[PDB]
Amino acid sequence: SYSPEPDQRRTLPPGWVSLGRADPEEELSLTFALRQQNVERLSELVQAVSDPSSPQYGKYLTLENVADLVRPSPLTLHTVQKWLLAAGAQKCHSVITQDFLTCWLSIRQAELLLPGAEFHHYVGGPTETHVVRSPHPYQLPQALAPHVDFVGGLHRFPPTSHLGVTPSVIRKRYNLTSQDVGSGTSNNSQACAQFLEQYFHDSDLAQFMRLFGGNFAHQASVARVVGQQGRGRAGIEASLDVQYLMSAGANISTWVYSSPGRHEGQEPFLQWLMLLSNESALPHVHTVSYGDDEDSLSSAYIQRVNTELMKAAARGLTLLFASGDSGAGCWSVSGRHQFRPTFPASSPYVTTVGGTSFQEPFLITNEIVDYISGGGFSNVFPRPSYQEEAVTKFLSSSPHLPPSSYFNASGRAYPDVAALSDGYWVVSNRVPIPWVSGTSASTPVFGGILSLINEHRILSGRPPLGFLNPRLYQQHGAGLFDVTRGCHESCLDEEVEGQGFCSGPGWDPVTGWGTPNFPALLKTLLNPR
Amino acid sequence: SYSPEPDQRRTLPPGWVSLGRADPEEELSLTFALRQQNVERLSELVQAVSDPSSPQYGKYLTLENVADLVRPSPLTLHTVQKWLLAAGAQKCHSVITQDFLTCWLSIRQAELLLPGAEFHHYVGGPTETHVVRSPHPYQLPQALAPHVDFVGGLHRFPPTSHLGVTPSVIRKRYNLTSQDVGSGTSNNSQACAQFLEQYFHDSDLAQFMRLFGGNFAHQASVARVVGQQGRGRAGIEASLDVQYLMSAGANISTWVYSSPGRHEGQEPFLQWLMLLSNESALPHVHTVSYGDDEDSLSSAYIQRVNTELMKAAARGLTLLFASGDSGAGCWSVSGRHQFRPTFPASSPYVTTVGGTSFQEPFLITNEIVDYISGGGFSNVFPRPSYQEEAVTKFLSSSPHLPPSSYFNASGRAYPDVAALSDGYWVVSNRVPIPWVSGTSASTPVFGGILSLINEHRILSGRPPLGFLNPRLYQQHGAGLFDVTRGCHESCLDEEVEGQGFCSGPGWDPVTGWGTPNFPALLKTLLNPR
Ligand SMILES: [Ca+2]
Ligand SMILES: [Ca+2]
Ligand SMILES: [Cl-]
Ligand SMILES: [Cl-]
Ligand SMILES: [Zn+2]
Ligand SMILES: [Zn+2]
Ligand SMILES: [Zn+2]
Ligand SMILES: [Zn+2]
Ligand SMILES: [Zn+2]
Ligand SMILES: [Zn+2]
Ligand SMILES: [Zn+2]
Ligand SMILES: [Zn+2]
């Protein structure tokens, strides 16, 4: 037989208590990632539709278009089924793109179905979510190697984790006016997704807005919540996402994605991806907080996720991801240290958002790099051509360039952009919390400002921004305040003594093109083209 | 009811697995620290005997003098024995100084003995090591308050933790000559103490000396081994301390203390400290690698250990401690960050050794601080007068002085001296290991050199150096190579950013007075006073 993910890290993360081996008769939800077809063609379409110097720019594909393009062959669907029918797979659902299948099997059924699998069960977090996973690798029978990419639910665990920043601070700094807000009578909407075991509360948002929202028109509440369950206790990550999205993109209808699938033995991020391909009418802008160490991921997983991201860009969705909170990172290989890039941040098909900080203790005059701001170079995805200019420029001109031992210069470099990541006020469990920091903060801020620009485009005769990056780089980041001072963190060692890459004049791998000066951005991204 | 140690950290350290609640009938070994007399007298005696401007300089107490001085009152001896007898404490061992008492007790009896104690058991680290400890606080009947300092074995867990550096290299750099070795027919001896689950093997020492001992006279084996009752695997640390002590202080009779007491419910370091006070004829120089975060320790424990360190100084023992391997450290107190001192390193009655590295890849011309070199300011012990001048110079004249928020200027500053800590070759389990780093490396190197100086003194009829610091500081550290470039590590935060104190032209809290230039050192410490 065949082992599709031999390179998937299977080790138990910290914060997870191991219950023993799993009960034969105990159930499990596996999600089978079915072989797609015209992937190469999709990659061409994405570029045709998102490069502005291309006649098809903005001529986005409907979900239906995407499904006609990418859906598995009839041999795939038939073979995967039946094969699943036997082995007892019970009531399953697919999606529109029909390239995913989630079923219910008893573990002893799954264990025979996926030889090598040996399910244990765990409980983890501050909160405590249940999973069923296998610390041993699995195989598919050789038969359906060309029909299944991987099986979700086997190894990857869900995530576990100056002056104070206020909405007014953000609007002042990014030159948002009291009027620079949504005229919510179009179909423009925005979303944030988050995958911890937290709940966002309607009440906390209302409280937040009462305290902070006086000087701008704002939506009372969330338009829609996807993936809710029961009664909850709020956490700061779930609150920050929504509270700041709805402040940076003020009077705009907002959807919230609340760790889909999690309450079950499922991969939340995978489930959210799956969900994107099961509804045709989606928000134009999505801000996401999610990452793994790039090196921990199987090639099959990492490549397939990248394809799902491609499918998003084809539909004119603009996807933003936090660049991470560990700087360049730190990875000890053989017997050395390297930087440690992160993923879905390292994906070429996403807008990755870095972290910024105030320069002086008491003033908001200027932005400097925030120490924690994730950035770097992929070990998996080659430099996309859209950044060829900016990246080579950085490599050839940077004085504080780290030893090339620590990274791969040929890889997709990131982040793409940045915003304040330091010292946010959030409301959670009806209490205000002072000094919340992270690139999870900057991603929704950048997101909402983008979503606001989408309104000016669609109210006009124009299509949404979609996959922004090619335009962004093409226009030399124009519009964004260019962050020039500071470096992010890395390994506590002798070579690279706590220091990763540094910010410099052009684009850089700590803050991208820098930070959103709304008026300037508007202009540039509203130019005809 | 009295709580003598409410300020002792009781939390489980990492690398420890909790078994259940301990069985009542399960025996257990407790070590009772008995109330001492005349501690302030002991203090005066130390200064009289260690201050080179004293006419009592070098006139050391005998162990029996110390015992006569310090022993508990007859009231305490009687009251403690009635008390233990009735608790069921089975046959007990004391020491010569009569201020320690180790007994065997049922767990059940320990619990009555000490209301509040609830005993759990745990297994250790890379070595499966057994302890029995209480996660809850314990108290003593009010009647015993005057008579008992504390009970050992209740909360503190044992420890779990560019060219190569060779004996050759060390001898070259510290200007040791092939003749600068021990003429082993006096009673001069030296010793190392280590507290991990590791054994040192004679074979490895022989192998080490065969490979590196080529061009200096050396001793075949360890003269004596205290604390070992079987076989095992050699550990890197146990190997390092012994191998480099016998190279720096070559052809000198050498004793190894091997984690005394560990194979029971005993605190190895405490147990080692007891043994000191149970043998009259001891080696003059002791090199010790042991450390806890200072703040983790109860007042009663930390003050008492300091006293035992005073007993050792009074007897003309030279005690050396590694300064630690996390620079200034990092401590998140309330909502803040401070440096994190270590102890016994912070004790004013010990000689603390920091860490050095070679500047260039291929040459031994110059030393630089080793990033990991422990140092700082005590929050417990105040600056001793012997270092008033040096610390004041450093405080007043250092540029790169960290935020004063991070430390306490009025505390015992350390390290006092330094030696190479980077890139040691060791033989462990008959295999040579290349890159052994640490301040546990530098301590034996310093100690060995000191022990050679003792030989020159004793031959020619002078006293041992004993507790060295007063003389060392008084003579402005001279005969040590003064280290001046580099800083040690600290918090990865936005106010300090991985950097602690920095080295400077004189004494500093990263390398002390610096590095042992033998000829010069010889000259100053062998001359008059
Ligand atoms: Ca820049
Ligand atoms: Ca110095
Ligand atoms: Cl346009
Ligand atoms: Cl003398
Ligand atoms: Zn197994
Ligand atoms: Zn279960
Ligand atoms: Zn800050
Ligand atoms: Zn250009
Ligand atoms: Zn309890
Ligand atoms: Zn036990
Ligand atoms: Zn080194
Ligand atoms: Zn002086």
Side-chain angles (χ1 to χ4, degrees), chain A residues 1-196 198-529, chain B residues 1-126 128-529:
Chain A
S1 47
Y2 179 69
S3 163
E5 305 194 76
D7 48 338
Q8 176 58 60
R9 172 195 200 73
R10 302 189 299 287
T11 61
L12 183 68
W16 289 94
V17 180
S18 188
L19 286 36
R21 184 134 156 65
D23 211 324
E25 318 291 49
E26 188 189 329
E27 306 307 320
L28 214 183
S29 164
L30 287 336
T31 292
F32 301 86
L34 306 185
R35 191 60 104 272
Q36 305 159 307
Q37 292 198 248
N38 300 111
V39 170
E40 171 165 23
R41 227 281 178 249
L42 177 65
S43 65
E44 285 177 27
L45 271 14
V46 169
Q47 175 143 359
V49 120
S50 88
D51 181 358
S53 71
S54 161
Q56 317 293 227
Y57 175 82
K59 301 190 187 175
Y60 301 123
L61 285 66
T62 171
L63 182 63
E64 171 66 357
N65 284 344
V66 161
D68 281 14
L69 215 211
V70 99
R71 82 161 56 82
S73 64
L75 187 70
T76 303
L77 292 180
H78 170 95
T79 301
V80 162
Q81 317 189 177
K82 92 131 55 191
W83 170 55
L84 274 189
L85 204 148
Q90 296 213 242
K91 275 146 196 173
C92 319
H93 355 69
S94 189
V95 309
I96 278 34
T97 48
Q98 275 179 314
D99 45 1
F100 286 107
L101 200 45
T102 315
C103 295
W104 282 105
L105 288 147
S106 82
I107 70 158
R108 41 104 201 184
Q109 286 165 356
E111 277 173 359
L112 284 274
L113 185 277
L114 298 183
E118 173 185 330
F119 297 104
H120 286 67
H121 46 130
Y122 310 81
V123 188
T127 25
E128 294 142 60
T129 184
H130 187 253
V131 289
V132 183
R133 300 288 193 264
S134 191
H136 295 336
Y138 74 101
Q139 315 209 157
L140 294 164
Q142 193 61 238
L144 80 201
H147 302 124
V148 181
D149 288 338
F150 61 86
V151 181
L154 268 102
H155 297 139
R156 288 171 298 275
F157 293 76
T160 189
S161 192
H162 318 129
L163 298 171
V165 172
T166 268
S168 351
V169 169
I170 288 171
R171 301 198 139 244
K172 213 279 146 52
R173 171 56 187 169
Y174 296 137
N175 291 325
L176 272 293
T177 262
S178 61
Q179 307 292 295
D180 289 329
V181 160
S183 58
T185 1
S186 169
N187 231 290
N188 196 35
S189 53
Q190 58 190 191
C192 56
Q194 186 263 338
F195 305 90
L196 303 186
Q198 297 161 12
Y199 294 69
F200 106 89
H201 287 177
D202 52 289
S203 53
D204 287 352
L205 176 52
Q207 183 172 342
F208 181 89
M209 283 302 179
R210 285 194 301 275
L211 288 163
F212 296 123
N215 194 246
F216 63 85
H218 56 264
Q219 289 284 185
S221 42
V222 173
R224 179 169 167 185
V225 180
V226 195
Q228 215 58 285
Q229 324 274 193
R231 201 193 74 70
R233 149 86 89 164
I236 89 163
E237 149 97 57
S239 299
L240 174 84
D241 271 49
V242 189
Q243 278 151 202
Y244 278 90
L245 181 54
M246 295 183 79
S247 300
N251 195 43
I252 310 177
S253 186
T254 302
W255 295 26
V256 166
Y257 285 91
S258 207
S259 196
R262 183 202 204 72
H263 187 269
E264 301 79 308
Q266 277 172 11
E267 312 188 19
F269 182 82
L270 187 57
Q271 210 72 3
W272 170 82
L273 239 36
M274 272 190 70
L275 265 37
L276 256 41
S277 279
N278 213 41
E279 175 159 5
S280 177
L282 289 174
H284 304 93
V285 165
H286 287 79
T287 64
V288 201
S289 230
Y290 194 86
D292 285 288
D293 293 343
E294 176 174 78
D295 57 275
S296 76
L297 302 177
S298 68
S299 167
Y301 175 78
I302 214 182
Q303 290 302 331
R304 171 59 180 269
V305 165
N306 197 57
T307 297
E308 296 302 319
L309 275 5
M310 280 199 314
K311 307 200 323 197
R315 301 167 63 189
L317 276 31
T318 146
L319 269 48
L320 307 91
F321 281 84
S323 75
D325 291 343
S326 301
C330 193
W331 187 21
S332 146
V333 176
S334 314
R336 301 211 281 62
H337 289 162
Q338 301 175 0
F339 297 150
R340 197 173 215 166
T342 245
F343 178 94
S346 56
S347 174
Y349 291 103
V350 137
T351 312
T352 307
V353 180
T356 234
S357 173
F358 283 126
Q359 180 158 216
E360 20 187 355
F362 251 100
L363 302 305
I364 74 167
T365 314
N366 224 274
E367 281 168 289
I368 202 175
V369 302
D370 192 355
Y371 188 50
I372 69 170
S373 181
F377 289 74
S378 180
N379 295 312
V380 175
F381 292 109
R383 193 147 78 209
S385 72
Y386 64 70
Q387 59 173 21
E388 172 72 357
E389 191 181 2
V391 171
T392 51
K393 270 198 196 174
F394 169 82
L395 270 356
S396 47
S397 71
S398 174
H400 298 103
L401 200 58
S404 58
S405 164
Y406 275 62
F407 72 102
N408 233 299
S410 59
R412 186 281 203 254
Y414 71 86
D416 296 300
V417 301
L420 285 167
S421 57
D422 185 29
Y424 284 58
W425 279 100
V426 137
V427 175
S428 191
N429 297 306
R430 306 156 210 241
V431 73
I433 318 308
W435 304 99
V436 177
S437 309
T439 49
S440 310
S442 25
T443 309
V445 159
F446 207 102
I449 278 166
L450 233 33
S451 170
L452 177 46
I453 285 174
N454 264 350
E455 269 218 19
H456 285 76
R457 286 180 60 78
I458 87 188
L459 278 174
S460 195
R462 277 129 125 199
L465 280 166
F467 171 40
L468 171 60
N469 286 189
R471 196 199 265 241
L472 171 63
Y473 282 75
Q474 151 178 144
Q475 287 177 338
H476 308 141
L480 308 176
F481 174 93
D482 175 43
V483 183
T484 306
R485 200 194 174 204
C487 324
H488 61 14
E489 75 187 347
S490 200
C491 307
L492 287 176
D493 68 33
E494 303 178 314
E495 276 271 356
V496 144
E497 192 173 300
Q499 191 181 111
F501 302 102
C502 300
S503 63
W507 169 99
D508 58 56
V510 193
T511 54
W513 290 106
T515 266
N517 179 201
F518 174 78
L521 249 194
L522 219 211
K523 270 206 187 214
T524 64
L525 289 187
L526 244 188
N527 276 357
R529 182 148 98 239
Chain B
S1 201
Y2 179 64
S3 168
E5 285 196 293
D7 50 338
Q8 172 61 58
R9 181 167 71 211
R10 301 184 308 265
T11 58
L12 190 59
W16 288 91
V17 184
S18 171
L19 284 26
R21 177 113 155 73
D23 167 288
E25 304 322 308
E26 184 179 343
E27 294 294 321
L28 217 220
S29 136
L30 284 344
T31 288
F32 296 85
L34 307 184
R35 194 62 111 266
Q36 292 154 311
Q37 294 180 101
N38 296 136
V39 176
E40 179 150 338
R41 263 13 91 201
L42 172 63
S43 161
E44 288 169 340
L45 261 21
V46 168
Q47 187 190 341
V49 121
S50 70
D51 194 300
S53 59
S54 185
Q56 313 271 204
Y57 174 81
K59 264 123 281 202
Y60 303 120
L61 280 62
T62 224
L63 179 49
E64 204 56 44
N65 292 328
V66 165
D68 285 352
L69 202 217
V70 99
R71 68 162 47 92
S73 79
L75 184 66
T76 58
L77 292 183
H78 164 92
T79 302
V80 166
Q81 288 168 22
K82 272 281 176 116
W83 184 49
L84 283 174
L85 199 288
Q90 313 220 79
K91 216 69 275 209
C92 301
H93 310 329
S94 207
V95 297
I96 284 167
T97 48
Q98 291 207 275
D99 52 4
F100 287 109
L101 194 37
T102 290
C103 297
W104 283 96
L105 279 170
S106 308
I107 261 161
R108 168 185 36 94
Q109 294 170 343
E111 291 182 338
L112 277 200
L113 213 251
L114 309 204
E118 179 201 337
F119 290 98
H120 293 247
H121 47 300
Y122 312 87
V123 301
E128 298 184 335
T129 310
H130 192 279
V131 295
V132 169
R133 299 279 187 275
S134 194
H136 299 324
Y138 74 94
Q139 36 190 48
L140 291 171
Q142 184 76 213
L144 281 286
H147 308 305
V148 180
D149 288 1
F150 67 79
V151 192
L154 268 67
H155 307 125
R156 292 170 294 271
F157 294 80
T160 291
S161 92
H162 283 277
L163 223 156
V165 164
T166 304
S168 159
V169 171
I170 288 174
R171 288 193 153 257
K172 223 304 174 69
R173 172 58 181 170
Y174 298 146
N175 296 314
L176 283 296
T177 222
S178 48
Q179 280 64 41
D180 290 327
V181 158
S183 57
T185 3
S186 167
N187 231 289
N188 197 33
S189 52
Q190 59 191 191
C192 58
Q194 196 260 339
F195 301 92
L196 297 177
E197 11 72 71
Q198 310 163 353
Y199 295 62
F200 99 98
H201 299 171
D202 291 13
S203 39
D204 288 341
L205 179 57
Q207 182 174 352
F208 177 92
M209 283 306 177
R210 270 199 307 280
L211 219 309
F212 299 123
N215 311 69
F216 66 82
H218 52 264
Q219 227 198 357
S221 61
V222 169
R224 195 180 164 192
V225 162
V226 193
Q228 258 190 38
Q229 335 89 246
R231 222 150 307 124
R233 283 217 109 212
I236 296 187
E237 234 241 80
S239 303
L240 168 75
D241 300 317
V242 192
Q243 287 164 196
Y244 276 91
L245 183 56
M246 297 187 74
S247 308
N251 209 36
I252 293 163
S253 189
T254 301
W255 292 23
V256 169
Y257 293 93
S258 55
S259 187
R262 160 176 283 248
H263 330 256
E264 299 83 357
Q266 281 166 23
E267 300 178 29
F269 178 78
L270 185 52
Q271 216 65 5
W272 171 78
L273 221 38
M274 275 186 65
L275 267 34
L276 254 37
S277 291
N278 217 31
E279 180 131 19
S280 193
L282 286 174
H284 295 128
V285 171
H286 289 73
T287 61
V288 201
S289 146
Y290 188 79
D292 291 298
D293 292 322
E294 182 177 75
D295 61 279
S296 72
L297 299 181
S298 77
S299 191
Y301 175 83
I302 206 175
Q303 288 305 337
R304 174 61 179 262
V305 175
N306 192 57
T307 301
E308 299 300 310
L309 267 11
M310 284 194 266
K311 305 209 310 205
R315 297 167 68 185
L317 278 32
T318 308
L319 268 43
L320 304 102
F321 285 77
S323 74
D325 297 325
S326 311
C330 192
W331 188 19
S332 309
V333 168
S334 308
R336 316 177 105 271
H337 282 192
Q338 323 184 333
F339 293 158
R340 203 175 198 164
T342 264
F343 174 92
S346 56
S347 168
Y349 297 107
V350 121
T351 301
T352 302
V353 188
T356 230
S357 168
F358 280 128
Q359 181 156 221
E360 20 190 353
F362 250 100
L363 302 306
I364 76 163
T365 314
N366 223 275
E367 281 167 294
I368 249 55
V369 337
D370 194 355
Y371 191 59
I372 67 186
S373 187
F377 292 73
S378 195
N379 290 308
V380 170
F381 295 108
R383 186 153 51 207
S385 53
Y386 67 70
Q387 87 184 347
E388 189 64 56
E389 192 217 7
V391 178
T392 290
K393 274 210 211 192
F394 172 77
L395 262 13
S396 58
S397 80
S398 183
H400 311 92
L401 214 46
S404 90
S405 168
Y406 278 64
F407 68 101
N408 201 334
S410 73
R412 185 277 203 261
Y414 73 81
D416 296 294
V417 302
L420 289 161
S421 49
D422 185 32
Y424 282 59
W425 276 103
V426 153
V427 184
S428 216
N429 302 287
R430 302 148 211 254
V431 68
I433 314 311
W435 298 116
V436 183
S437 287
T439 223
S440 290
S442 38
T443 301
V445 164
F446 208 103
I449 277 156
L450 225 33
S451 191
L452 189 49
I453 285 186
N454 262 0
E455 267 229 41
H456 277 81
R457 288 178 56 80
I458 292 154
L459 299 156
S460 97
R462 278 178 182 153
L465 290 166
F467 170 46
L468 179 73
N469 295 178
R471 197 198 253 245
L472 167 62
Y473 278 79
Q474 164 170 160
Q475 301 215 94
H476 303 108
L480 299 175
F481 170 88
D482 171 47
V483 185
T484 291
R485 290 194 169 168
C487 318
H488 64 5
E489 71 190 344
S490 198
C491 307
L492 277 195
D493 73 24
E494 71 192 356
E495 189 176 13
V496 123
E497 215 179 282
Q499 170 172 124
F501 299 109
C502 292
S503 64
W507 178 94
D508 59 56
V510 181
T511 60
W513 290 108
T515 266
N517 180 26
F518 179 77
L521 249 185
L522 216 209
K523 183 166 182 173
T524 71
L525 294 169
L526 188 43
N527 287 20
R529 291 146 52 181

